[PDB]
Amino acid sequence: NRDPASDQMKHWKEQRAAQKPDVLTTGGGNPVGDKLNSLTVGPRGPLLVQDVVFTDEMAHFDRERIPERVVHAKGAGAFGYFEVTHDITRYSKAKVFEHIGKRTPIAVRFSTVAGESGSADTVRDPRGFAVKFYTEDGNWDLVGNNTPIFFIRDALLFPSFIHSQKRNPQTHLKDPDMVWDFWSLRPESLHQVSFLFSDRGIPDGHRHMDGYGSHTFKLVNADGEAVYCKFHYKTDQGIKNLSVEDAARLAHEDPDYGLRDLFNAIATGNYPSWTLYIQVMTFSEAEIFPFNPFDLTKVWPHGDYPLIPVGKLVLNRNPVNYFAEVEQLAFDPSNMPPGIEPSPDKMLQGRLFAYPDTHRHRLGPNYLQIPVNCPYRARVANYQRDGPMCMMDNQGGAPNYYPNSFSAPEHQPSALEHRTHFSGDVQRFNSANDDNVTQVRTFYLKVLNEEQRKRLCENIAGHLKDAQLFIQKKAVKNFSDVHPEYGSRIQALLDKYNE
Amino acid sequence: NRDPASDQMKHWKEQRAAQKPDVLTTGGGNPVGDKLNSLTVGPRGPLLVQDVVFTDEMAHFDRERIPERVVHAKGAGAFGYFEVTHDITRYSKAKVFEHIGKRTPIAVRFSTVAGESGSADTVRDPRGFAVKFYTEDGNWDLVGNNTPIFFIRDALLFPSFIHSQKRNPQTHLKDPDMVWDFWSLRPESLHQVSFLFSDRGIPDGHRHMDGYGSHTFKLVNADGEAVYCKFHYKTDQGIKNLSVEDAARLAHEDPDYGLRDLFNAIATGNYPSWTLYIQVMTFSEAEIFPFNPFDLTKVWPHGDYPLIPVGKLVLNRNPVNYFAEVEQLAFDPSNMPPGIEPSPDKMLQGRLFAYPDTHRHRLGPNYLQIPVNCPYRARVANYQRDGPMCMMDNQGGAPNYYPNSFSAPEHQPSALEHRTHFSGDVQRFNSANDDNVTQVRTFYLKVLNEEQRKRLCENIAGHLKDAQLFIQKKAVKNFSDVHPEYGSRIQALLDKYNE
Amino acid sequence: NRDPASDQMKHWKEQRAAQKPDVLTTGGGNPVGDKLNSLTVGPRGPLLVQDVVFTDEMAHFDRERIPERVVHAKGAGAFGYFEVTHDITRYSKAKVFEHIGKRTPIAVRFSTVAGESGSADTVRDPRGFAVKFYTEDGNWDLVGNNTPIFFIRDALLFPSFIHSQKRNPQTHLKDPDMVWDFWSLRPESLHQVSFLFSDRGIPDGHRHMDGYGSHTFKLVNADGEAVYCKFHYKTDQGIKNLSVEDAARLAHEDPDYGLRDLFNAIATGNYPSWTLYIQVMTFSEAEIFPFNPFDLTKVWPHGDYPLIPVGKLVLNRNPVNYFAEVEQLAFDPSNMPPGIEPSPDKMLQGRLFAYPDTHRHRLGPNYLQIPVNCPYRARVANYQRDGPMCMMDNQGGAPNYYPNSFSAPEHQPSALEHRTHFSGDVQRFNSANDDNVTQVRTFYLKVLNEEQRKRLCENIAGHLKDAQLFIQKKAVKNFSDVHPEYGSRIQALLDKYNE
Amino acid sequence: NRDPASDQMKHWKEQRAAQKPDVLTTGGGNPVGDKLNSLTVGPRGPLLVQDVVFTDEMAHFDRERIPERVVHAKGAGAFGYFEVTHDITRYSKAKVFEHIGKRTPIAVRFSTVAGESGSADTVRDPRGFAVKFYTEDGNWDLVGNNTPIFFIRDALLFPSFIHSQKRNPQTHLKDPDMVWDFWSLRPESLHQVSFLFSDRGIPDGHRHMDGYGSHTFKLVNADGEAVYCKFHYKTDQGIKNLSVEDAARLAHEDPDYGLRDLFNAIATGNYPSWTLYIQVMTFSEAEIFPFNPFDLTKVWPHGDYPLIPVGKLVLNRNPVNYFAEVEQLAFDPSNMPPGIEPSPDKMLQGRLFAYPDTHRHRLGPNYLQIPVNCPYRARVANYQRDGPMCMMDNQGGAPNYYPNSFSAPEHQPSALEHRTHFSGDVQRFNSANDDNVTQVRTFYLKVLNEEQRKRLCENIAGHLKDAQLFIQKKAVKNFSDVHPEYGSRIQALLDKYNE
Ligand code: HEM
Ligand SMILES: [C-]#N
């Protein structure tokens, strides 16, 4: 009796008992006598502007679509909650970490990157794992990928990068030259490239993948002590990837594979879950790290900085209306309540700006006012007013300037940001040469096995092959620098593909 | 102390009581630690991207403004109720007239016409009197002026009319050449131009003027019998207008005179009111009527068509937040509940398209979702989805197609349009010379008395005198047609004015 | 060496040689010193708002996306010209057909339907074939499809139809319950559904494939005599379709298959072309003719109304910048120069509003000001002003109200529309029953050969086999209502799929 | 014959002697038959959607309005040129100062601050004076006011400030409590408040007022040597302001007095001009300066930092279409070319963000492409693409990723920002007490004479008298802090006013 998903309407008509259906109305609420036959003059005459029943619906029709996400356009979402299982208060005075058994409702949206709205899940691309913590101190957004690292470490190259992985400005077709001309000129991607073309390249569904905040963040206890951290939410359904083969099969067989896997899962009562951990680094150690603790192209070896469990990320309800609750979702890295703060991680810094920016454009100035985005477990009160599509009462007739002598909202000094010290010139400091191989080399011949080491080298060559020859070399060169073998294997492969 | 309007905050803080100032949060609901000083590297250093309290706030301010209404930009609003005092049901079956005593929540917006957001209330100009009935059959928006007639009878000339009435495309100044060159070329305006330059051209506040639906409408009863009608809502505060010197004074002394007079009255249990009447006419009568019964430049003489009392219009509530409840208010003449239907009035016909059309651009595709515009009395159920800034549930997961087989919203034969028959060549009929003198002639001699006729001519001459001689000629000519004396009197003044 | 599309950048550079690369600047033209390293205080310090180079690029990137077309998102486009080869002057006075040899620049975008921007080119779904003629009497948009009929005959059914073919409101996946449920309760779709599931369902590229004006139109000659007609532009590369499996693999092998094909063809000098034909029907015949001549689910048979030759459609130019020239492309069926006029088609009429309406939403109010949409081979002069993103000079200091005595644009009586007579009550006429089978049966037998007839039934069952039985019944019922074996054959197929 | 502005259309008609009126067309370029009569039913029948000429025009009319500037909405603009007259090449290497005689086009917009578009010109209020220099190195926007200081010093107070300066959230009226409750609590304003209420508060048009950069900026020469500065461009027409008397008369007799004046002056060859001087403070002196050198509520005494002639700002060309060339006009302080950078001024810092941020909303993502805003004197080349209302060729088929090996634009190292060192903890430093009286006292006692102090206190007390008693206390208290005599005089006046 198909799957829970396919029976979407099925279950709807049922649960809708036997009570009559609501009356079809116009946006205004005026009942429609007949919305199947246009208002015409004669059985074969023209249409009347007077058929506002028509205009009303058609009008709305022509405006349903809104701009898709610049990146991560294709994804799925579900709601659930978080719960504490450990006490890290000695680490961060965040309200969500209150005490054990302390729950918080969440929202999540998995997704790919380069692919548009029509794209299919089952394909090589990093994955999006975003969590919205509707806390008491406002919503907390831990926007993270399925990997602890990224290709670039300076926000200034992301626009270019994304462009590189997307379409040709002219042909509107994917383009290897673009893809690899960028990667080749910027070896800093070496680390993440290797992760993309590794088995992890294509997770089997969203449920069998690990979550990562990626960036280095900052924790601060109710005592004013701050320490750098890294979030890790590992899957409790075990890691499971998809063969280049299956992936491509599913790709066209069920483009929305990863999509319904999630739905049915939650429907068949088999709710997904991830275990939230966090690494820790004192400012002392941070000054010692063999690298930049804020370099997005690096990791904190688990041996030197072990994961501390903190909580359970459980999803148990699926969106009722996809658009409203998922397509419309807004995740802002800048959304961090008292206890959690960003690090000087140049990429994070940029994200502090881009997300709310794009949201205002994709969704609208008052998008945080959208049900799904509104921090309902907090009391939003301030001196911001109006704006297009202003919902709510817009804070009634309350004094709209600060300061004021009329009892309008005051600032809670107990939430002040954490004071740090920086000494140096304001300049554009070149981070293009901050070691792009070390951690990579120990990933090729260390994290991976000879078995999957060959699968990786294959996956890569199967794409790099399509790039101009002048591109192919410069590329191998990099892989070469990570390890002559990790570069020779790939090359060999190319020579064969290359005929 | 001072007036209620001026005591806005005072009263707010008192009612607020001894409570504690809500915690000042970002749009995201995060507490602010100090919204008075920016995050900088040093006491005299750069501003950091890291300051999201600033940007969260700043970015909203930058997006505070929405386009003002292209016309009737300046205005004041108030909510109240509509009470049925009679049984008119013998004509219209709208559930808004159902049973005597039946109260229907209403919203009202008064306004001028030409002036933009910052203009003054005390200037000569028609006046807007929009009434929104939140009925159980959706919303009823009766968008009427304080005059029963208008300057033109074909929408095709409205865009141009409003242009001539506003600013010159290059100097951005008021243009008497645009104003009069247009009016002169369209004598059909003579009627309303008369009513305009008369003592009624500037009413003393909104509480002292009448409200007219202007257009001819339609009423369909339970049996399905229809009738043409006109709406009339006379003022219970009595017709009181302002003099050129006093209106001209208040222009600078208090540009928001109307907005204030209205706030204060209501704030002191001094609720304004209007009795609602209607002129009922038969298709057979509309057949006999000597003039085009749908021509916007004509009136239905009280004599032959006496007014029938319907109910009362009380405004007993003031807007809490002006932007959210007034600025965003949107009345669409097409929102007529079952029982009320439009008429062939060319003018009205065009308005059926414009209001929601422009509302989509001024407010947004989902404007009908704004609390003030939402038909909170009736239940909105249909097959329209998505659209930017989608509030509520987007009808959750109910079927989006129609018809369907899963118990989704159904038709309503009862609420069907009343069918009328028309015959003729579908073409653009020149309605330019449908007599633009007869009714003005009566207004000039029978409606006005000598002292009023005196003013009407000085008021005209005082503004017309700035247009070029040739326009003045053409202009006067049209006046003599209504009446020899009308022309000569104005002409007389012009020669004087032309020193 | 590789295909022309792949070598896009390669050539762009090659030809750009002998030239120094332009200086990288900001949106404002200020040269940037370094666009790879953000501005921070100290090498490991926070990002400074100061870095305006950053915000400029990021803010713009954060807004690259505009809403995709509500339908026909996945498409491709090219440019060419139209050449008059034959004289149909006695039918249309339209300057486009003026003389033999008359060249008129054109632009075209082909597309699929339901699938979103990321979808693949080769799938069962009709194909949009819109043609924009930049004529001296303004642009003429012939928004056609690769089929001469459509699933429905009343605009009111469209928003609902489209929803069925799209995603589920809650599970966001494609849904056969909606697809069929709709098609079941709506049999008039039979004609098109058959054609669709036919071999033509997956044309090769956008070349080989035919284009049809689809709707019935009206032609007017220099003597006011009007006649009805159907537009036809047959491929010069002969109808060639894709196999189910073939197209099924290309689906993931190369989703942009069309894009590639069309680009490379043109790029290599292999410019495709089409021959335009017209079927003419006189008002007399339109009267006698034996189902509604304006029904969109019906077709005129070359039998009685033989195809007449008019001219050639040649595409010899590729888009330089895709987004700018194809994505932003807007076609309005309502754009018809003198000689061409709408027809009572309930379906058409509706299109007369949706298109510009949605364009103002998706592209913006001044969309006709975007280069490729501008009627550049004409002289747009009128009384329209302002609007957002207003380009040009807003028509400069020209008078902006009509009429006027200042030499502003005067209208042309010549361009007056042809008048027709339409008698009959103005109401909602039921058309759900206008024969949704006759012609359909003639396709299954006469047109379709035992060969295609086999794959048609097979293709239908292959899809329909996923919907509840109660639907399958209704679906087979209508088919057998066309011809016993039609559904009979389907039914057999259906039962095997249901294990 | 009237003022040159009155005859706008006259000279336009005259302008095209001869020349025949262009043909009235739709937005698509289709010629119009009858633009005065809609297409109806019969002479008294309904309207047909089939009428596109109407809908084309109406839909546009319905979207003419865009959000008015959040502040400084009511203004006037003009174009002219900038001419170098002194070699200041030892301080700035900017090309706009490249060499004596060199002329650069400029665009200027004058403005009030609080009133919306309908507001009156002649009212006490600072005055906006923005200059746009279309320099070879991109556009340089010097966004100055008519005062060298400002009320607040930290951007976070700005939204608040402006709010208190506008209408009441509930009553929508100007709130004296709002105005003085805010000023009373933030004494840093005293300086501006005093300047504001002096004879300089209501200038006589835009031609008789000085223009000031206000903020301190950083000039950078060819040797990479930096220096701080302040821009001053004094009227050549002489500082002339209006009296509280005439100003109130003009407020109703001519709400557009400034608009009209500027136009006419230019129209009659009487071009206004301004001599541009600059002040120079070396990094050393900025160290021992008695006040914070980047504090907006302070000035650099001519005595120690003498003005230096640079060149002349001349305006000799009126806008042809106010909207297209003035209303749409946009200035960004961020637009600074090589040799002209920002200071750490907390206020200037927040501005680098807000202008482009707001322009992207008021005008749209691609507002830099609007003619008036485009840097048409430089070659904009970069890796930015798409966005709505994308004009030009969107950089065509150029490589869209940086870096790339395909000859796309490259960064110019000689346009890098001058590196400055800053050291301190990153925190929210409190500048609320950075001396808010010294300079004020000098203005009161030295800059003004008795006659003046008298008018000032009268002007201050005039408004203040309306605020609640407790607010008057606080305010007078602050004035006494500047000078015992200062507060007393105001207090005496208050004592009076209050009966
Ligand atoms: C009466 C039902 C129809 C309505 C209301 C309708 C509505 C729409 C809308 C709103 C768009 C998006 C336009 C844009 O954003 O540029 C569109 C696009 C399109 N439709 Fe129609 N459509 C209808 C029927 C069809 C049929 C019947 C055809 C086949 C001749 C067709 C061919 C197209 C094409 C080719 C496009 C994309 C044009 C392009 O930009 O390349 N549609 N339709
Ligand atoms: C519009 N009145």
Question: Is the residue at C138 inside a domain?
Answer: yes
- Please report the sign of the dihedral spanned by the C-alpha atoms of residue B172, residue B173, residue B177, residue B179: positive
The Cα D483–Cα D485 span in angstroms is 5
In one-letter notation, the amino acid at residue A312 is K
Radius of gyration for the alpha carbons in chain B, expressed in angstroms and rounded: 26
State whether the beta carbon of B440 lies less than 6 angstroms from ligand 2. no
Cα dihedral value C42, A232, A333, A435, nearest 10: 30
For the purposes of burial, counting CB atoms within 10 Å of the CB of B320, is it exposed (0-12), middle (13-18) or buried (19 or more)?
middle
**Contact predicate C189/C297, CB 8 Å:** yes
3-state SS, one letter per residue, for chain D: CCCCCCCHHHHHHHHCCCCCCCEEECCCCCECCCCCCCCECCCCCCEECCCHHHHHHHHHHCCCCCCCCCCCCCEEEEEEEEEECCCCCCCCCCHHHCCCCCEEEEEEEEECCCCCCCCCCCCCCCCEEEEEEEECCEEEEEEEECCCCCCCCCHHHHHHHHHHHCECCCCCCECHHHHHHHHHHCHHHHHHHHHHCCHHHCECCCCCCCEECCCCEEEECCCCCEEEEEEEEEECCCCCECCCCHHHHHHHHCCCHHHHHHHHHHHCCCCCEEEEEEEEECCCHHHHCCCCCCCCCCCCCCCCCCCEEEEEEEEEECCCCHHHHHHCCCCCCCCCCCCEEECCCHHHHHHHHHHHHHHHHHCCCCHHHCHHHCCCCCCCCCCCCCCCCCCCCCCCCCCCCCCCCCCCCECCHHHCCCCEEEEEEEECCCCCCCCCCHHHHHHHHHHCCHHHHHHHHHHHHHHHCCCCHHHHHHHHHHHHHHCHHHHHHHHHHHHHHCC
CB of A486 within 8 A of CB of A454?
Answer: no
Size of interface B-C (CB pairs under 8 A): 137
Number of domains chain D is built from:
3
Residues of D in contact with B251 (CB under 8 A): 251-252
What's at C136, amino acid-wise? E
Burial class (CB in 10 A: 0-12, 13-18, 19+), C224: exposed
Q: For residue A110, what are the β-bridge partners?
A: A76, A129
Contacts of D423 in chain A (CB under 8 A): 422-424
Indicate the Cα dihedral angle C176, C181, C187, C189, nearest 10°. -40
Ligand 1 centre and the CA of A40: distance in Å? 22
D427 assigned to some structural domain: no
DSSP state of B31: B
User: Hey, is B479 helix, strand or coil?
Assistant: helix
The dihedral region occupied by C90, where left means phi > 0, alpha psi between -120 and 50, and beta the remainder, is alpha
- To 10 degrees, what angle do helices C158-165 and C176-185 make? 140
Buried b (16+ CB within 10 A) or exposed e, B285-307: ebeebeebbbbbbbbbeeeebeb
User: Can you list the positions of beta strands (E) in B30-102?
Assistant: 40-41, 75-84
Instruction: Say whether C185 sits in a helix, a strand or coil.
Output: helix
For residues C224 and C361, membership in a common domain is answered with yes
| CB-facing half-sphere around the CA of B128: CA atoms within 13 A | 25
- Residues 382..421 of C with a Cβ closer than 8 Å to D: which? 382-399, 402-417
- In Å, how far is B351's CA from the nearest CA of chain C? 16
Partner residues linked to D211 by β-bridges: D233
In the DSSP assignment, the letter for residue B478 is H
B240 and B306 in a single domain? The answer is yes
Domain check: are A219 and A270 in the same one? Answer: yes
Atom of ligand 2 nearest to the CA of B113: 2
CB atoms within 10 A of CB B282: 13
Same domain, A196 and A295: no
Q: Please tell me if the CB atom of residue C158 comes closer than 6 angstroms to any atom of ligand 1.
A: yes
Tell me, yes or no, whether A243 and A319 share the same domain. yes
- For the Cβ of B250 lying below 6 angstroms from any atom of ligand 2, the answer is no
Which single residue is written with the structure tokens 């005859």?
A: D7
What CATH number is attached to the domain comprising D483?
A: 1.20.1370.60
Is D314 touching B (CB cutoff 8 A)? no
Q: What angle do CA A270, A275, A278 make, to 5 degrees?
A: 165
Chain A residues within 8 A of C167 when measuring between CB atoms = 322
Task: Verify whether the Cβ–Cβ distance D50 to A50 is below 8 Å.
Answer: no
- For A:67-86, CB contacts with B below 8 A are none
Report how far residue C333's alpha carbon sits from residue C340's, in angstroms, rounded to the nearest whole number: 11
On whether residue A416 sits in a domain, the answer given is: no
For residues C355 and C334, the answer to whether their CB atoms sit within 8 Å is yes
Output the residue whose Cα is nearest ligand 1's atom 19: C72
Which pair of tokens denotes residue D372? Answer: 């008036």
> How many residues would you count in chain A?
499
Among candidates C88, C99, C108, C104, which has minimal Cα distance to C137?
C104
Specify if C172 maps to a domain. yes
**Beta C226-235 vs C211-212: how paired, if at all?**
antiparallel
Q: Is residue B222 part of a domain?
A: yes
Tokens of A157: 């190259």
Where are the alpha helices (H) located in A330-437, listed in sequence order?
Answer: 346-362
* Cα C84-C85-C91 angle, rounded to 5 deg: 70
User: Is residue A160 domain-shared with residue A296, that is, in the same domain?
Assistant: no
Residue in chain D nearest B167 by alpha carbon: D322
Rg (CA), chain A: 26
Q: What is the DSSP letter of C327?
A: I
- For residue B114 and ligand 2, the question of a CB distance below 6 A is answered with no
Q: Which of A15, A40, A65 is the last residue of a domain?
A: A65
Cβ of B266 closer than 6 Å to ligand 2, yes or no, is no
Q: Are D144 and D131 in contact (CB under 8 A)?
A: yes
Q: Cα torsion for A419, A420, A425, A429, to the nearest 10°?
A: -120
A 332-361 residues inside an 8 A Cβ radius of B: 332, 334-338, 342, 349-350, 352-353, 356-357, 360
Beta-carbon-side half-sphere exposure of residue D142 (alpha carbons within 13 Å) = 26
Q: Say yes or no: B92 and B215 in one domain.
A: yes
Q: Residue ranges of the alpha helices (H) in A16-136?
A: 52-61
Between CA D211 and CA D73 the distance in angstroms is 18
Which domain, by its residues, includes D58? 1-65
> Does residue B422 sit within a domain?
no
CB-based contacts of D166: which residues, under 8 Å, 6+ apart?
Answer: D114, D174
| Shortest alpha-carbon distance between residue A225 and chain D (Å) | 15
- First CA to last CA across chain B, in angstroms? 50
Contacts for A226 with CB less than 8 Å, ≥ 6 apart: A218, A219, A220, A283, A341, A418, A420
What percent of the residues of chain A are helix, what percent strand, and what percent coil, each to the nearest 5?
A: 30, 20, 50
Looking at the structure, tell me whether residues A297 and A309 fall in a common domain: yes
CB atoms within 10 A of CB C288: 9
How many whole angstroms separate alpha carbon B9 and alpha carbon A495?
79
Q: Do residues C312 and C445 both lie within one domain?
A: no
Amino acid letter, residue D315? L
What are the beta bridge partners of residue A136? A138
A103-131 core/surface letters (b: 16 or more CB in 10 A; e: else): ebebbbbbbbbbbbbbbbbbbbbbbbbbb
Position A428 in a domain: no
User: φ, ψ for residue D213 (rounded to 5)?
Assistant: -70, -35
- Select from A321, A353, A374 the last residue of a domain: A374
Tokens of A41: 């003059």
User: What is the distance between the alpha carbons of residues B57 and A389, in angstroms, rounded to a whole number?
Assistant: 17
Residues A99 and A88: their CA atoms lie apart, in Å, by 9
Tell me the H-state helices in B332-483.
346-362, 438-442, 450-464, 469-482
| Resolution, angstroms, 1 dp | 2.8
CATH of the domain at C38: 4.10.91.20
Residues C133 and C159 in one domain: no
Please give the span between the terminal C-alpha atoms of chain C, in angstroms, as a whole number. 50
**Cα dist from D212 to D128, D150, D230, D274, D277, whole Å:** 10, 11, 8, 11, 10
CATH number reported for the structural domain that contains residue B81 in this entry: 2.40.180.10
Scan for tokens 């004197």, then name that residue.
D377
Task: State the Cα angle at D424 between D422 and D430, rounded to 5°.
Answer: 110
CA separation for the pair A148, A151 (Å, rounded):
11
Domain termination residue (choose one: A374, A389, A422): A374
Please tell me whether residues D10 and D108 are part of one structural domain.
Answer: no
> Is B380 at the interface with chain C, CB within 8 A?
no
What's the Cα-to-Cα distance from A357 to each of A351, B62, C85, D407, rounded to whole Å?
10, 12, 54, 31
For ligand 2, atom 2, the nearest C-alpha belongs to B71
Residue C356 and residue C485 in one domain: no
Structural domain includes residue D403 = no
Report the alpha-carbon distance of residue D315 to residue D77 in Å, rounded.
Answer: 10
DSSP alpha helix (H) spans, B206-255: 244-253
Question: Six-digit token pair at D86?
Answer: 């002194």
Residue owning tokens 């400030």: D161
